[PDB]
């Protein structure tokens, strides 16, 4: 009954306090230039204290869960709070809430050996070589991450959950003649150890084949099929920030006052839900213990509302939607997403590509870029991108896409049937999206 | 005799192996918008194993120094070696060498409390408001790091050292009319806890005073006085990589074949020496145990030679210069620097500014930038920068500097008397540098 006594101890110095304990075990392995370059195993604990006294906040962090270290951190936070000035906008920490039912943890990922990762990377090297004798795995990595979080506060909130996720990516470079392709990245992420290295290699090697044939690009107006990585990049930098209630309070979201209005084509449905079947982290509570839920942001093209954490919700007058995420370096809470889902459609990507007379498959946005989430404006470089002519991919190309994400979203005519989990940055679950007649500059 | 027995254990699977144990204790504190936002304490141990069998390399990492964990890591590395193909360019690990004398550790940094950092930040906030009621400490941080490293290998190399360093920076923003200044950064770094927060606040607040008066910039040819932060950024991105022996072997340095040629003005002497009086880390050995030394890179404008680690030196036929640095994520060895020193001059910055009819003091390079270390080409945004007219600073400005770092180095006419330690990027110990007739674009 340690943490119970620690809250009692903290209540001597604070009006209210929160204790969050994080535990993890991570295994990783790396490949450099067709050699396994590293395997590692890490595990540890981290405790964060947020204490408030007369609306003055103290926050202390220690990389331990032993009660003496946690007591020291409570004292650290109290001393900081006594040095801080009051935050008049502070109201209170979250109250206990009703949580969805916890899923069963995937304990095989709590005991996984780094050998699993090493062997999947070795297999990827061998498969890539078999499929194209000049294909090289220039870089790659795999990881398995097990996480536990215990959150409690002086208002009676206790929530605990643990679970794991695994991921792998390969970067493949080809050489045919004197052409060297750019690095082609592909990946897999899931909640079990059967990482699909075969699929990674097949897709990456296919895109290398196409990239052996560079074709010039011109100024034109053409359909673009965005892949998951390009969608994640563009939307994370230009669109998702607009859904934050903090920007509503600060008058920096172009979506203010547009609830119920059409901001995208009816083809687009976008929501945040950790309980989606492909989610890597089916968490029932956010990082300050508020229950998570399905938050619909765009419903059949119509803007539905904003996401909130405790602090900004109470400043505004509403309730948190369970979107308080822990800042990795500072230890504070900020508004963020759990699993951003774009709903899928009915036909395969191959059906959609087969019907394009002239167009581009945009797989990544590797290149010079700028974005402004205050109005949605953007300028990106499509790379890698592949020209489609008469329903067939003809080669690789580079071009510029400049415009506005809201205008672009209105050009969406279809979303493919499959969904891909993007593990990096914001976790995003998305299909391919076809946009009609985008103006591109060569 | 734990680690010697671990070496004997490793010799059953490997022709040769190295064991490196890192231990550290780090405390940090942060400020956001005139509030202390965080204090943290972290400590831990890390062991890296590099084993070679028939020129096949295995590398494993575990976040512990306990003998059982290290034994597991050796087995991990052995399994990786048997999966890898031989590196024909591999020759051997370093032999034992003769080290300079170890300085006595600065033990006061080994157990410092985050309270020290918190109070220096509180004092900085108070000083900033006292000196300018409209000055806000938008961001800042302090840190103390205590590090211990033990390296040994099967050829009989064993070296151990421990020591600590501390740093602090503040970012100060002013508001006078409806003009808000850009973030003005200043810092201090040293091997004791007497961090100079007074000096940081004085310099930053003075620059904020100047930044209240924005003045437009035009295309012209004018002298520039680069400060330590701008020198560190520019040189770390465009110049220092060219001194790497790996790039000499791979033919990607413009300095191939140029030993003895004047690549800079005679005013410039640049060298690598961890035993410099202002060095934060007086290390006697690099991360693979090779003895550390003074490496002169530019002597009175003349290019002297390249820096080497063990692996690339033996490929070329030379010897390591003690410049093998441990990669923070991969655990491998890469060529890097310890403390890059630019030799100082005889007169104060204040004397030098007093003689400029029209010019600029360039303090930061915050803005769009590109660089090519393969030829030294660069394009940066000078920001914050301050206009000098008839020996007096008149206000702040933003302009572009594009060109080639070697051409720029030929323009160096003098260096100030003081030397500042830059803790960020490559640790750099440098004065201000006055460059004659630089072409700038408004």
Automatic annotation (TrEMBL), chains A, B:
<dbReference type="Pfam" id="PF19290">
    <property type="entry name" value="PmbA_TldD_2nd"/>
</dbReference>
<dbReference type="InterPro" id="IPR002510">
    <property type="entry name" value="Metalloprtase-TldD/E_N"/>
</dbReference>
<feature type="domain" description="Metalloprotease TldD/E C-terminal">
    <location>
        <begin position="220"/>
        <end position="442"/>
    </location>
</feature>
<dbReference type="GO" id="GO:1905368">
    <property type="term" value="C:peptidase complex"/>
</dbReference>
<keyword id="KW-0645">Protease</keyword>
<dbReference type="GO" id="GO:0016485">
    <property type="term" value="P:protein processing"/>
</dbReference>
<dbReference type="GO" id="GO:0008237">
    <property type="term" value="F:metallopeptidase activity"/>
</dbReference>
<feature type="domain" description="Metalloprotease TldD/E N-terminal">
    <location>
        <begin position="18"/>
        <end position="81"/>
    </location>
</feature>
<dbReference type="GO" id="GO:0005829">
    <property type="term" value="C:cytosol"/>
</dbReference>
<feature type="domain" description="Metalloprotease TldD/E central">
    <location>
        <begin position="109"/>
        <end position="210"/>
    </location>
</feature>
<dbReference type="InterPro" id="IPR045570">
    <property type="entry name" value="Metalloprtase-TldD/E_cen_dom"/>
</dbReference>
<dbReference type="InterPro" id="IPR036059">
    <property type="entry name" value="TldD/PmbA_sf"/>
</dbReference>
<dbReference type="InterPro" id="IPR035068">
    <property type="entry name" value="TldD/PmbA_N"/>
</dbReference>
<dbReference type="InterPro" id="IPR045569">
    <property type="entry name" value="Metalloprtase-TldD/E_C"/>
</dbReference>
<dbReference type="InterPro" id="IPR047657">
    <property type="entry name" value="PmbA"/>
</dbReference>
<dbReference type="Pfam" id="PF01523">
    <property type="entry name" value="PmbA_TldD_1st"/>
</dbReference>
<protein>
    <submittedName>
        <fullName>Zinc-dependent protease, TldD/PmbA family</fullName>
    </submittedName>
</protein>
<keyword id="KW-0378">Hydrolase</keyword>
<dbReference type="Pfam" id="PF19289">
    <property type="entry name" value="PmbA_TldD_3rd"/>
</dbReference>
